[PDB]
Design a protein around this ligand. Structure first.
Ligand code: 2P5
Length: 262
């Protein structure tokens, strides 16, 4: 869907990300939207355009909904559902006095979105709490799934670059740049750890380079105080050295529902 830019009103600046400025606005006068304004040189634009229809067909309650794009102009606009509470990481760190039931509910929200993406054989490639958003009701939804592919920035795309998500990557991504549904599984386990530690930085006080080395040897994130033994077993299963020994999102989602019922 090609949104006519005359149907958008720009109301507030939401901040800056990898692709530049993001604004809050209204679409067709009534619908609350976030609008990414793609800065010149930051994206592989023609590749993104010739695949944006697939991304629009991605529709799930726990996925930030893509409403449309403005591609007959520069900057390109990406118009999505608005999430009033911003990113999950900053949200975890904030007054909320979270209960363990709420922490699992957040894991479930993310897992449902990821099981849906897995069912469509679509990789997120940068799953982390900083890339999940929270709405006015405290519902967590995953955002910017598949956009990692289109980043034009060597510090981000190189596994040894300063911006590469090393702390959310499995050994086969760090050593061989081998992305799969199993590399998103690993990132999900790290995200579960971010949630249960209330937004702590994974492998705190260690650099990306030391993290890459330690993970390859077998170091794993400690069990957070707020994680039960059952919850830790689930996030730990995501970090198997062998990608084929890691569960699928179907299994994780089923395991999370089982813990919830217990
Ligand atoms: C996502 C994003 C980025 N990042 C990128 O664009 C990006 C990320 C990753 C990559 C890859 C490819 C590298 C992976 C590429 C690009 C930067 C800025 C905003 C947003 C953003 N913010 C939203 N809502 C907010 C935000 C803030 C506040 C606020 O001010 N608050 C919070 C509450 O307390 C008070 C203060 C309230 C609501 C959205 N709602 C729907 N979409 C939204 N997008």
């Amino acid at each position: 869907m090609e949104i006519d830019p005359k149907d958008l009103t720009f109301l507030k600046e939401l901040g800056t990300g990898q692709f530049g400025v993001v604004k809050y606005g209204k679409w067709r006068g009534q619908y609350d939207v976030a609008i990414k304004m793609i800065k010149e040189g930051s994206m592989s634009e023609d590749e993104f355009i010739e695949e944006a229809k697939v991304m629009m067909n991605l529709s799930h309650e726990k996925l930030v909904q893509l409403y449309g794009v403005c591609t007959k102009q520069r900057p390109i606009f990406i118009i999505t559902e608005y999430m009033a509470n911003g990113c999950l990481l900053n949200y975890l760190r904030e007054r909320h006095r979270f209960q363990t039931q709420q922490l699992l509910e957040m894991c479930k929200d993310v897992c449902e979105a990821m099981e849906y993406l897995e069912s469509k054989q679509f990789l997120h490639r940068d799953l982390a709490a900083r890339n999940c958003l929270v709405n006015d009701q405290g519902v967590v939804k995953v955002s910017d799934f598949g956009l990692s592919r289109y980043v034009l920035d060597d510090e981000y795309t190189s596994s040894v670059g300063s911006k590469f998500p090393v702390r959310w990557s499995p050994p086969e991504v760090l050593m061989y740049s081998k992305f799969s549904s199993k590399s998103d599984i690993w990132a999900f386990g790290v995200l579960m750890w971010e949630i249960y530690s209330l937004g702590k930085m994974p492998y705190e006080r260690f650099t990306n380079s030391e993290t890459a080395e330690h993970i390859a040897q077998g170091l794993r994130l400690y069990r957070p105080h707020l994680a039960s033994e059952k919850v830790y077993t689930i996030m730990y299963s995501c970090w198997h050295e062998k990608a084929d020994e890691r569960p699928t999102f179907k299994i994780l989602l089923s395991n999370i529902l089982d813990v919830m019922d217990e």
